[model samples]
Target: GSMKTIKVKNKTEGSKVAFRMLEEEITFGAKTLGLATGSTPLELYKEIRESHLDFSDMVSINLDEYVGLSADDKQSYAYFMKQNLFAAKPFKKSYLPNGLAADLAKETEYYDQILAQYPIDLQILGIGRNAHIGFNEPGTAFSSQTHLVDLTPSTIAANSRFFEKAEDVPKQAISMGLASIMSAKMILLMAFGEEKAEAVAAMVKGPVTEEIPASILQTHPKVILIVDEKAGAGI
Candidate 1:
């Protein structure tokens, strides 16, 4: 009926719990994974890489990518996936939005088709400080599908920490919409640090609204939240 929240002592333990859940789901025939990119998933990826589970026959679709960066760019989500997880334990096939595609509308259409062909069995997520999921910032329509979005100032500021200069951060991104994410059979969300405490609480107990994209998960059929003590404090 609502999300099942698990409060762990710290991020390492949180990651272990998430890893175990993912492993169990995979063992039970969950083949398609919807993955996210951010600091939040780093530990989980580490756990996955150190595990013995085989993902050679699995499919992975990433949630979003910056609009102007090439896949080869160090800051690109594709590159993050390769460095963090794919290099050590590759999926059978992994799909990510082509940031450099000549026509982004056509790219979204193609990505939607891929989603239709391989509906996600398990979708992993990370919440932004403003409660955004993927690049679906405040005011995004709940029924929207894959689309392009101008990055919010807050989002750009937060991500700027990763770039050498704030101005170097991409101004736009292509993200899977709320409709696409809701189609997943199961969802796992992870958050850590005190900076995320308010957002985590809002997602878990606040009203479901387009203003807080992650709040939509409250109505999802199967959702698990793995958070550290600091992040879960507001809950």
Candidate 2:
């Protein structure tokens, strides 16, 4: 089938539309959901939390987490999801990479097995300024699975704006790899702000390349990219 795109007015409206589609899919038996963390998805999380929507039967797997932060750390992805998205509407189970894994490969294998069993029905994603998705930095293998990644300089810079100092930012993370994301039945990639416009254009219009890892979405069977006016400016 040929590619199809749905453009929404903004992130809030976009997420509402996406969740409506999600609600219908789950009603028909889709149970496993893949999710992303960060300020970008905050609006989507709020909608779910405030709508009184039930998610007790769903299983949610987060896209990535900092390698060394405690799960309880306020800034950690695990904590972020609980506070931002799952506090009001809980899931049957939610999975996130443990920050204390002594052997990264063993940790990866564990999550890989769970994903193989559940199989993601939908994946929510946000692109890094440098074009990474779920911490799968530039040069990541297309077939890669869960793994640890050194936070790129650009990522640190971009994320530092939220912290008191650049030195306070985390330096590494464990992220679901490109292979896991591409295997999902559907993908939703989101971006906002003019700062992200260049990268968004590169991923959507440029050739597939490791330098822009998110560009790999072009090969996926089902994907919907939602960008705000600022992020879509370049296109």
Candidate 3:
């Protein structure tokens, strides 16, 4: 099926549109949400935080988390969510991969079970410059479930800005895989900046392949892409 693309003037406009769409879905009884953490969704989170919408009865499951980081770690995805969204617009229940789990394999299985029990009504995504989604990088299997992933050097470097030093970035992560993400009833993907232009183009126009993880969204039943001019330029 063809994906919908919404071109906006900038991140602010894009965020507003994204928020409106999400609010509408919630109003229509969308419950479980698959959420992403990153700079790309900051504005959307801001809009959500300031809006009058109530998420007190909603459920949220995060896409991934750094393997070595604890929930309290300032750089951890759990902390990011707390600071950006959960603090103000609390969900009925929020789940994030336990990055500090002693047994990651078991943890992955546990997360898979949780996802199965509360299948996402809508999933929010942010594409990597390399076109990866949820840390499911190049060559990840399309049928993969929740699993651990080795962070590529490029991914590490890109995330270094969040830490005090480049080497401080975690080397691995627990990510909800391609299969898990594709299970969502609907998907909303957002991107910004010229840095993402090529990747956005590949995701929207390239063939579905493991080399560009986001390209799989092309085959999804329902997907909405919100992008600013810079990121949508190639499309």
Candidate 4:
């Protein structure tokens, strides 16, 4: 069977639906949350930040990070979460891969250790145009875990502006792979605008394969898809 798809009028509406579902999970004692960053989850983060949600007793683990950025860097995922969601609503503990760690491979293994110690109750995800979740590209092994990624030239060139503004863009990234995501008790994936239509369709309608990481959802037991009309058009 296909995953549950919650279609809404637009991005904001989809954000509301995502927040409500998240609130329900929290109300039911889900404590470890897997969070994703980017425009897709910004509105939902706004709702959570403004709401009476108390994440003080919970734990949070992020999906990925750029290898060259420090945690304090404005563009880092840690910084993004701080500015977007954590500044207002703090978790008891939060974790994200250290892209600049003294030993990058060790850092990824440590991230995996954290995942094993405190399993994620709910995971938030955003799909890229290539149907990637986190920084794991299409065709990546489905059994992959938290790992370092060497991005392709086309992809590296695509987001050059963001990285160049601070420093030379690095081709490396540390991200939670498909297997790590599939381990969550529940996954809530959101997509907005027509730009995400093809990826959303690839995830929901296409065959399951390593070629499309998001399509790994097909094998997941608990997945909630929240998309606006435009993104939903593909399926």
Expressed as tens digits, the lDDT of each residue in 54-136 for candidate 1 is 88999999989899889899989999999999999999999999999899999999899999999999999989999999989
User: Which regions of candidate 1 are displaced past 4 Å?
Assistant: 154-169
Distance (Å) between predicted and true CA of 171, model 3?
1.6
Comparing 3 with 4 on lDDT, the higher-scoring candidate is: 3
Q: What is candidate 2's lDDT per residue for 1-235, written digit by digit as tens?
A: 2235566678787778767877777878878899987668888888878885687888999978887677887768898898888788889999998877888789888888888988999888888888888888888998898888888877778767776766667888888899988888988777888778888888889998888898888888888888888888877
lDDT, candidate 1, residue 222? 94
Name every residue pair that clashes in candidate 3. none
Q: Which 10-residue span in candidate 2 carries the lowest summed lDDT?
A: 1-10
lDDT of 4 by residue, 32-150 (tens): 99999878999899899999999999999998888978889886879999999999999999998887888988989999999999899999999988898888888899999999899
Give the CA lDDT, 0 to 100, for residue 105 in model 3. Answer: 99
Model 4 misplaced regions, further than 4 Å: 163-167
lDDT of each: 0.92, 0.82, 0.92, 0.90
Q: All candidates' TM-scores?
A: 0.94, 0.89, 0.94, 0.95
What TM-score does candidate 3 reach?
0.94
TM-score of 1: 0.94
Clashing pairs in 1: none
